[PDB]
Write a protein that binds this ligand. Structure first.
Ligand SMILES: NC(=O)C1=CN([C@@H]2O[C@H](COP(=O)(O)OP(=O)(O)OC[C@H]3O[C@@H](n4cnc5c(N)ncnc54)[C@H](OP(=O)(O)O)[C@@H]3O)[C@@H](O)[C@H]2O)C=CC1
Ligand SMILES: NC(=O)C1=CN([C@@H]2O[C@H](COP(=O)(O)OP(=O)(O)OC[C@H]3O[C@@H](n4cnc5c(N)ncnc54)[C@H](OP(=O)(O)O)[C@@H]3O)[C@@H](O)[C@H]2O)C=CC1
Ligand SMILES: C#CCN(Cc1ccc2[nH]c(N)nc(=O)c2c1)c1ccc(C(=O)N[C@@H](CCC(=O)O)C(=O)O)cc1
Ligand SMILES: C#CCN(Cc1ccc2[nH]c(N)nc(=O)c2c1)c1ccc(C(=O)N[C@@H](CCC(=O)O)C(=O)O)cc1
Ligand SMILES: CCCc1nc(N)nc(N)c1N1CCN(c2ccccc2)CC1
Ligand SMILES: CCCc1nc(N)nc(N)c1N1CCN(c2ccccc2)CC1
Ligand SMILES: O=c1ccn([C@H]2C[C@H](O)[C@@H](COP(=O)(O)O)O2)c(=O)[nH]1
Ligand SMILES: O=c1ccn([C@H]2C[C@H](O)[C@@H](COP(=O)(O)O)O2)c(=O)[nH]1
Lengths: 511, 511
């Protein structure tokens, strides 16, 4: 009964030139350190490594303190290690054996009472050995989300779908995404599968009085994507079947909340590929105050097309609107609130209230002010819009450490399709503002009104809730020096890093 | 050896009148009593104990209480009176009679060991007064009837009867949410006498695993006011200290949620008295679209006075405003969104969007619509306002059973002073709208963006947290038939039933 501890790229790479492939992952080191050391008294833990693995270690850290170090080697002897450095008091002497099966017997022989848990700690030779012999009950894996040049690899195994797209190992633990030196990563654990309260109790018994789950086997649910997945399950389990403007049926709930950290990684949902080109192109479009949808479509982003066709414009009772014109919609209200709309071709510069600019000026000069809001809802103009805004309001907030948070309120949420797009969209806006105001991005908070999954998406979502999420990627702003105002960002000023989502899922847009 | 009291009680400790129950039939209580007295962990059963008159007050079809050993403390009644009262069913226990409760407890030990699990004193004042004297009462199961009723038999006084009203001990360990039957609100409290299966997952939890609590001894926190109390405790412990517009220090968080049911009772917070006359008269003020704060002031509602002084109006750079004119504030945007403001005396009938009309109409005609929103936030008009709206947006929702829910979004939340008032104000509006649309009120959802406590309330709030909440009151709309439109409501048309708050705590308003 042994455990495998590893840090590992999506392609199972683990080393290069007898060393680590990535810059230092401090939190990984701390995690590895804690896992291999902590115990429920008299007992300590055993770390088993290979020669190359022992040798790669900086001399400062070998031998691994408070732990019975063991090396598997044919060519090195117990004296080489005893003479490599002078030993310190309070530790066991490193022991060397022919193979892993041999190295295990040594633990059964001499250390039958001293040690608690055993850990195979590297490298490819030993990990492979343990997998063959099937004594490994658990895998403590650090998924490095970025790809790195490698010559040494972790052997393939049943259930390596947790790494990338293609007696088993199923995930039982998935942590939130951490990042160090511009490298996003997280921790999984895969398991080998193949009367002070008595008085209250019966009162609870009569009170309770009356199905679908996301990745049910995953018990510790650190990953923040669980919010979205538990939110899906919830609506399907406890929603209410409604009719619709569209004619397509709906299961809905009212009043919902997720929030996402922006300091370590970016919440680009990993359980299905998010059309990021679309969120970027559209957010840029918003910020310009552009209301011509053809500018999006010509760039290969057809998200608004169905909602600006000749047919739809007339159902919405706007025969005079050119094909493409979303009326005075989201962008317009951000940049020219309450201005008199004409068409998508008109220049509205200096007109209306520039909510966006005001929000930034306030952020830069008086960040304690509680009137840092931007609204898209304009009662007077709703009829002129092709579609009333879903995400209609956002508030910004700064704390002590110059960390920026953003709340967005959405009236009507398409959970299968719209939500992950809207999460990534406003999380990006936060990064943009944070940079321009000289603030650290902290948190994005999602406030939802009518929250619904369409009945024709239900089949497809059940498939999605079997998928265990991958580590969130990092979004970087490039050209950090060139960009000084919110209007200075372009499509080329960003780079998604480490995005390894699951394959695409087709969902029809309710027209 | 330890005994449990079970009682339904009036705020003034009243339990009976005319050898009967003071209130109409409270069904959930009857269920609660039924299960708590009957349920047992195979061979055993429970014992119930009562005075002669409690046995007499009981309906014939219910006495003796099935599946329980009935025992009556009396000197006039004899055992053969009770046997020759109703034919014995096969499988039951023979009711027993004793001269005193001490003798009753003797009978339990002497003969009924190995037979009875739990013992329950079940009434009336004589026995309850007795059980407290002897000090054998381990737990008191109290149903707190919030309404006052005519009674001639009372529950004895006891240390810890502060759970009922304002003033070896009895401390709460369980407080349930409010239920109501036949216009009677009530809740359930339980008082106490004081005077590597999953272990392989726990090590990675250790380095991830990490000061002020409300009513901590209370472990079951069903009561919905715990939301507010825990929201106070969260900000204080985990909040960040900011400077302020007003100049006073602040502790804060970003955005938090609460939700309150409106089907059983009304979320008029009990742990400190809420100025209901204020909420009611202000809400009506809003509905009218009235911008003259003097109309509030002349009625004894001075909540808007410190923000319409010549001083504040001039500091807000509005010299030409008459004293009392809040500018185009909440009411005005609701009823005349976007209208060109002059002064508080102008008739604006027919100008701007009447958002409130449009919302009611959609509700009454097309309830599955998702654009049923109303906003007070109008960036073009902000500079003309005495104060930018705090609660700036609210959204409605109807489900299967024609039930109405409401969300309100509040950009800035004075947790100590304003939040309780705001919970009451939109919950009241939700009752009002439901009545006019012919709907059942279901739920009020509070989204607050920036949530804070003022540092000159921290002492007053820590005090408040020691207080445990009382049952919520029922708010009734009187003269239903007359009121057909939102404007038909007047101050007299509301009745607050069963409100028993804790003492008023003085908290000043920051200008
Ligand atoms: N990312 C991660 O989590 C980890 C990465 N690494 C990386 O991997 C590399 C080191 O591992 P790797 O290069 O695979 O070398 P290994 O650590 O697998 O050890 C190889 C040597 O050890 C002996 N050995 C190994 N396996 C066996 C076996 N089953 N039976 C008998 N002897 C055995 C052999 O000695 P002989 O030749 O005398 O027979 C062999 O030459 C480094 O680049 C390191 O950075 C290492 C540990 C963890
Ligand atoms: N809301 C609630 O939870 C409950 C309410 N009730 C209500 O309360 C009222 C009953 O209370 P109450 O009027 O006090 O009547 P009780 O049920 O206390 O019975 C009174 C009679 O019982 C006997 N008795 C009671 N206590 C003692 C004692 N310590 N020692 C000796 N004899 C005792 C005496 O009868 P004798 O003269 O024969 O010796 C006395 O006259 C009713 O109106 C009933 O509806 C009752 C139970 C629970
Ligand atoms: C929200 C939003 C912006 N919008 C605008 C928009 C307009 C009308 C809508 N109508 C409805 N009913 N649901 C929506 O989500 C929606 C979204 C979008 C519109 C379509 C797609 C879409 O067809 N899906 C993408 C997948 C993107 C993703 O994975 O998130 C695709 O490739 O087809 C995405 C976003
Ligand atoms: C929110 C709101 C409406 N308003 C308007 C209003 C205007 C400016 C404000 N300014 C600040 N800083 N905090 C507020 O809560 C506040 C509230 C209120 C203003 C004052 C009181 C007040 O003085 N307290 C009440 C007690 C109410 C309660 O028990 O909760 C009183 O007794 O006078 C209440 C509501
Ligand atoms: C510092 C993180 C290394 C690490 N991280 C995680 N998550 N799992 C592992 N098995 C390892 N190891 C084990 C010890 N090791 C090592 C290499 C150089 C210095 C110190 C230890 C080789 C890789
Ligand atoms: C309907 C619940 C009455 C009740 N509820 C609570 N919470 N505590 C009690 N002690 C009682 N009792 C006991 C039985 N009882 C009674 C039972 C049936 C009919 C009339 C009275 C007299 C009052
Ligand atoms: O960013 C968006 C845009 C649209 N929608 C969905 C929500 C609604 O299902 C639909 C619009 O219909 P109404 O809410 O306007 O009825 O589009 C989103 O979820 N997010
Ligand atoms: O209905 C209201 C009105 C005001 N406030 C409080 C919150 C803020 O502390 C203060 C307004 O100050 P600014 O947010 O405008 O700075 O008044 C409320 O909580 N509710």
């Amino acid at each position: 009964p042994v455990c495998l501890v590893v840090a590992m790229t999506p392609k199972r790479g683990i080393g290069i030139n007898n060393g680590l492939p990535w810059p230092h992952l401090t939190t990984d080191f701390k995690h590895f350190s804690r896992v291999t050391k902590t115990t429920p008294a008299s007992r300590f833990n055993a770390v088993v490594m290979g020669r190359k693995t022992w040798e790669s270690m900086p001399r400062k850290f070998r031998p691994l303190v408070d732990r019975l170090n063991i090396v598997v080697s044919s060519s090195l002897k117990e004296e080489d290690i005893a003479a490599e450095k002078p030993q310190a008091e309070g530790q066991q002497r490193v022991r060397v054996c022919a193979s892993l099966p041999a190295a295990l017997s040594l633990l059964e022989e001499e250390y039958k009472d001293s040690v608690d848990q055993i850990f195979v700690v590297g490298g490819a030779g030993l990990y492979e050995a343990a997998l063959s012999l099937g004594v490994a009950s658990h895998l403590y894996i650090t998924r490095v989300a970025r790809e790195f040049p490698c010559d040494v690899f972790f052997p393939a195994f049943p259930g390596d779908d947790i790494l990338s797209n293609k007696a088993t190992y199923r995930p039982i633990f998935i942590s939130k995404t951490f990042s160090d030196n511009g490298v996003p990563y997280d921790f999984v654990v895969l398991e080998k599968r193949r009367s002070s309260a008595a008085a209250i109790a019966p009162v609870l018994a009569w009170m309770d009085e009356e199905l679908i789950r996301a990745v049910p086997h995953v018990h510790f649910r650190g990953h923040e994507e669980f919010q979205y997945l538990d939110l899906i399950a919830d609506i399907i389990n406890n929603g209410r079947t409604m009719d619709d403007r569209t004619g397509v049926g709906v299961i809905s709930k009212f009043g919902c909340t997720m929030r996402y950290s922006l300091d370590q990684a970016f919440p680009l949902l990993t359980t299905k590929r998010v059309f990021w080109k679309g969120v970027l192109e559209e957010l840029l479009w918003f910020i310009r105050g552009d209301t011509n949808a053809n500018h999006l479509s010509e760039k290969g982003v057809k998200i608004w097309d169905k909602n600006v066709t000749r047919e739809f414009l007339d159902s919405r009772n706007l025969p005079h609107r050119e094909v493409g014109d979303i009326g005075p919609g989201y962008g317009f209200q951000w940049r020219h609130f309450g201005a008199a709309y004409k068409d998508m071709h008109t220049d509205y510069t200096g007109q209306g209230v520039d909510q966006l600019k005001n929000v930034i000026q306030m952020l830069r000069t008086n960040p304690t002010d509680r009137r840092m809001l931007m609204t898209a809802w304009n009662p007077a103009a709703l009829d002129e819009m092709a579609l009333p805004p879903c995400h209609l309001l956002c508030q910004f907030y700064v704390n002590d450490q110059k960390e920026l948070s953003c709340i967005m309120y959405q009236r009507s949420c398409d959970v299968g399709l719209g939500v992950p797009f809207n999460i990534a969209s406003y999380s990006l806006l936060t990064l943009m503002v944070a940079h321009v105001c000289n603030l650290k991005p902290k948190e994005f908070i999602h406030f939802m009104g009518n929250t619904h999954v369409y009945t024709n998406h239900v089949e497809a979502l059940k498939e999605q809730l079997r998928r265990e999420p991958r580590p969130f990627p990092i979004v970087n702003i490039l050209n950090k020096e060139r960009i000084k105002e919110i209007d200075d960002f372009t499509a080329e000023d960003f780079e998604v890093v480490g995005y390894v989502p699951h394959g695409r899922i087709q969902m029809e847009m309710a027209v």
